[model samples]
Target: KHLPEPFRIRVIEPVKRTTRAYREEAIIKSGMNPFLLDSEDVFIDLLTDSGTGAVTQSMQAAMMRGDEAYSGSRSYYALAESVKNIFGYQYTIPTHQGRGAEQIYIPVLIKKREQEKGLDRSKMVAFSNYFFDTTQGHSQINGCTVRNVYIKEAFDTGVRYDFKGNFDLEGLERGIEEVGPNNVPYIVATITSNSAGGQPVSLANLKAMYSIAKKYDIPVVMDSARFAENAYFIKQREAEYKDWTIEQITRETYKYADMLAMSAKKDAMVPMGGLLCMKDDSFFDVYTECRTLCVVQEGFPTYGGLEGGAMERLAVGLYDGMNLDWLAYRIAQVQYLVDGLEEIGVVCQQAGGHAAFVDAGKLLPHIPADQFPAQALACELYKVAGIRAVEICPAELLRLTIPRATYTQTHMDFIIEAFKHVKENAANIKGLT
Candidate 1:
């Protein structure tokens, strides 16, 4: 909190202040769907970190170099090198965005049981605490099911601990046994639990999770979209890693994994980017065939549905994001909002890793869960401050997603102040349908 941002804003966009009347009309006009609401109508758009922040000057400059060649491009190699350096991946498979990577990678695992050995597709993947929609949806698409393992402390927000996100290894082993060793395909570790308010996993848990998976001959894959945020937490909160750099933490975290999928948009400061990585060469041969399918579905083998410029910007941002200073400062910024909201009783008692979540169930206890208290509170936040957020779960949890280095504390203060206004008038709005 004491240090200023290492970078300055070179360009700016203007946000118009709309009247409360227009705000009310806007929600109705958008069909009461936060996803349907126009971004221009919203003053503070904490909808999601995806494409939420402004790109840096270097990222803009790199755009000029996007080679439109259908075959191999220098930018592709640049991105591949960057991916290897930051994530310690043996191979890199690119995608247009996060879901695209999920689609590409899951098919490989799912198909492994499909055509290879002609099995009945019973392969499963386990998670630390939760998996977001993309991870869950793709797992469903692949003729596989999900197995979730979480520590006992993950349920209550009032736990007030650092590693509540840690995976219970015994539960994980139990889950692995439930599906049988051959039926389970891989283990997906999500650092900063997205569905459960961006809670994070500890480095020790990651290592333990890999050990358990290996014992069952199941590979461990990371849904490592915002692993940088998790690494920042490790540097600050974990005593053993206090002196370690963000890159070191990131490297060591991935070291314990067999593979990882990255949503570069979340941590790399890219407009759109996704990548898939694996450890073994046999997997690479299968992954190569998978890449061939991507060539058919997405683009040529080298481009991966992204232009050379996009890849360069993504590669540059990867290193830029790895800077220990930016990570520390942005983590501080996220914590600032968490502290402010907790003080005003707007968020969960415990803070989060990447985003802040408001416990609408606790805040608006009169409303029933089936009535969608979280959705109602989301609309109310927009109704009050022209801010847009989304209900992450039916448990009355609303996610306020902030982009790294793109927003300031001023935005945080404004959001908290406006939420306080909603708290004072909570009785007026009943609940959303």
Candidate 2:
């Protein structure tokens, strides 16, 4: 049975108020209150309808007509066009999810490189091991002889999450040289790495990598799952980029990318969907051919949706996604959460990253990595304040993602207070055996 000794609650006066906290709490609480308190109205509903609505409206307009035979295929094309417009790419493809895009693209790119170089099918592809979510596709690529060239300090458990830094450019260059342009397929990088606490790669660093990939004619595929968030940070943090708008920053950074893949579920703010953008038409040929084998029906290159409905949703979502006000509000919500935690002495990663990375290593350094510090912290946080956060500590970092739909300022304050309580009692608790 789950016992009482390991779980205890302490009483303390709440932290004093501030204007920022009050404003954030008002917004977050209104939208996320019942959910945060486990209210009955807190349902895991889908928002694809908003995107779906766009498709419905488009269908009603009937800019083009097609039989049911082509309906399944035509929607994907529309979806692709929507993606192309947002991303400024010539070609776009739709997949059931973000990983689906990777599954189709990586193999074909490798085969193309192999045929060109007369290399064996088993040649290696290079990537970073910084964040595994983005790297999932890379792992699949591994079976086809794809190898990773991770930067050092990609997994630091120290006080700082090591944001505001750069990737190991030398290591990456060395990796390319070792793979040899003849045998290597492509180089993969994430704009804001998910596993590396969602840290953003500096614009200068991204440009350098793009240049290197181009020099070797090795296609650079950017995993842009968090590109939207990254764009906001780039505008705020990059000195040279202060003049650029979010859309401009995104387009410029992607200019160097031969192909780009993204999760619409995250950046697109749609409930379920993902996009693959390419600079050329030929890439689509290979992607389309392979897509037929996996998920032929859901994603059409011309219009992306199920029966033109999903396509409309994607189209509208893309439009809304680019709205400056919507994006700014989301970014502010994340900062509000960070500010709340900081006020209580709970260390977190810098604001520019994807989520608030709680220093679980510092919080529970005595616990071995094998014991799962981040996971443990997650459980403890829930037990103490009824707040939920993901654990990122390979042994100790607790990472909390602020999904745009779920966060509010008051909810964040609740989290901050809980963290303070947890830290104060951390040493007194019995160590996990």
Candidate 3:
């Protein structure tokens, strides 16, 4: 059984129901990619959690009182205060989204290399427990080599390890030694490391990881889109932190990080926003340089391509996103869905923080990775039940990413039933090229 939602649904948005025949044609039209599928054709949309959560009453009320100013928006100050209190960061620079922050910060790190060590982007290498798609793209496009130092358990979908998102301490030290610490720009700690099935990095692991980075003199940047969810997992799983409040765990999590890059769309519970923050005084030059890029690429440093109203809601939503009851319910919902899938012979990547990841390669063993077994299973799922799930191509996994506080048990049941239908006729599903 799962906990009931802590909040009520006063507003409703109806989703369209489409027939299998219509979806079949739609899938073909979409180049067989769920990303290209029309939302109107998706009944139970589990495509993404990014910016898809419902706004809270507090968030809505705060947005109504936004102070829109070009340079000195009170809404910006409100968001800055929230960042300081929650993340313990001294400087906050807003961005259009998480990717925007990545775009701005990667360049700043590259410049630091030239100024400090007289090296360039080609000499820099970036490491993470795992890098999500966009971050990897930005890093590689900017001439830096990206590597993963995740524990081996993270690669096995059937493994039931608790902190599968933890960085492999041995792997990290070895990788840094191979490239030399001066060539490595920084280590990214993506809380609830998304690429590895939304698994969380333990608080103990975080502290140790920071200690290792400090030993090598490499700065740590927390990719904190789901930091709140990661904190909730720590409170639930780590015995030492069992009694800690979510905010307390969250603050401690950031203490290890010298900088933070956040996509407010996820953990912040807003429609859209992002932030880049700094605490180490040595980063003042980097901060100043990023502010100039904010004007060139995003909007002014204060607004950062977001309206004052959006920032107002984001400030309120940050606290709401960290609510204990809400976090418990959100995670329970994912676990419930995982339980149902597993009961019906579907293999899941344990119970993750936000999404239920299905092992498509295991289900369709005959299909090879190059053929994209996960994409095929995703298409069949949509055709059979009007549900939408995205394929993580390289991993041969299908991710059913649940939006925060958006769907209910009924929706989960609907998705499970859809899976049963697809599973019953799995032999007929063909792999995509």
Candidate 4:
């Protein structure tokens, strides 16, 4: 039997249950948007896993070794070494965070590729399922277009056996035909797709996507924000990889990518850091020459390492994030939420990675979506229990990404009780305008 957590807590922080009246006032003051609510009013913030983690004693200890040199710092080398070793990438460029990396690449790579290819309307970015909302923001930076060719089953959310992040080969062929190969800049496969219910991409799909990219001579970039989690899912969900170690799975997964972009916060447990690395350094000179813009835009070659534990902690997180037992425990926390929410009779997506996506529309079936049923349910949850959750879409899926090694069983029990309260008052919930 695997335990829910692989580690024990050494410290505790106090959290108080706020009053419903207070939450209502706070929500109103924030313009009825959960995104605007103050943290003081909320008991638990499930808004995102980004920046949600505890620094390990080991990582915390490493903070002492931070090298503050602007360029040739030991800290940058440490992070570079970690990226090279853990991800097996040939080259890595440091960024303040993931979107910064995207801002760099999408413009340099996507925009320039089109000018060289002389595509009339530039190109399109294709995803296996759904790209992260911010990734889309990155995609849109230079008049870019994004498309999806997810497997037919991805739409259902009921089929849970295999990887739900598979691309439809036929759909992809049609998409390329529609956009024209010359106009297709690059294909992106978001491992552990957060936008599509936190589903994972299968190795088969990755290979097929890689093959298709080769067929069109298009470079394939991996949005590897949750690569460790995606690797863990592949080990558990894919037949050929069931017995493979998480790091082994990660290594195998990286073998198919031409380039990778990351937000290390989620998997690596670093407060903030990101990687934009390449499988081969063919464009190393060109990229560094282009680093003129990056130097002005981002920092020097070292980028950023001056702040608290950015490189040291990131180095540790590279190893710690791939810990299989810890990952099993993390994955189980997500499952526990899925089970508990389902047992309370709240609708949810099929068990997958990272977040527990509850079907909020079902919870407020009587309310028309035009009235913002999902957003209303989120408000109702905050009012009832001060529990924060993000409304994913009109499908009414509420997303709660489990923070690693932060929450305990008692915490889980409290959340379940809050959801229980939500279920009890479902019928009377007067949704919204």
Q: What is the C-alpha lDDT of each candidate?
A: 0.78, 0.59, 0.88, 0.76
TM-score of 1: 0.95
Q: Which candidate is the best by TM-score?
A: 3
- Name the Cα RMSD for model 3: 1.3
Per-residue lDDT of model 3, residues 1-433, tens digit only: 7788888787889876788789889999999998899889888888899999898988989889887898979999998899889878888887878989999998788778667866556667889999988889998988889999999898687668879899998899889888878888878998898988789999899898999898977878999999999999999899999999999999988998889988989988888899998976877887898899889989899998888888888888889999999999999999999999999999989787899999888888777667888888988888888888987533768999999889999989989998888888878778788
In order of appearance, the predictions have TM-scores of 0.95, 0.76, 0.97, 0.94
Cand. 1 Cα-lDDT? 0.78
Give the per-residue lDDT of model 4 (tens digit) for 279-365.
Answer: 767657436643555576677757542343577778887888888888888888778878888888987887666778887778778
Worst 10 residues of 1 by lDDT: 117-126
lDDT of 2 by residue, 1-433 (tens): 1111211223322433334334334324544222232322221111111121112233334324432344445556666666676667876666555766776667667777777776455556455524345355554544645454445555553444323434577777777787667766767767677766566676787888787777887777888777776777777678888889877888787776788876666666565666667877756655555455345544444433334544455555566555566567666666677777776777766654446777776677676766656666665565555454555223345667766534345666677787888888877643433
Error of 1 at 46 (Å): 0.6
Ranking by TM-score: 3, 1, 4, 2
lDDT computed for candidate 4: 0.76
lDDT of 1 by residue, 1-433 (tens): 4257888789888888899999889999998877689978988888888867777788889999887777878888888898788877768777788788777767776666455434357555544467678888888887778866777677577667787677778888887677666666667788766666666788987887888877865667788777887888887788889988888999989877877877888878887887777765746865686687788767876778888898889889887777777877777777888888888877573666567877888888788778888788888888888888997533557878887666788888998898889888878867877
Evaluate residue 177 in candidate 4 and report its C-alpha lDDT on the 0 to 100 scale: 76
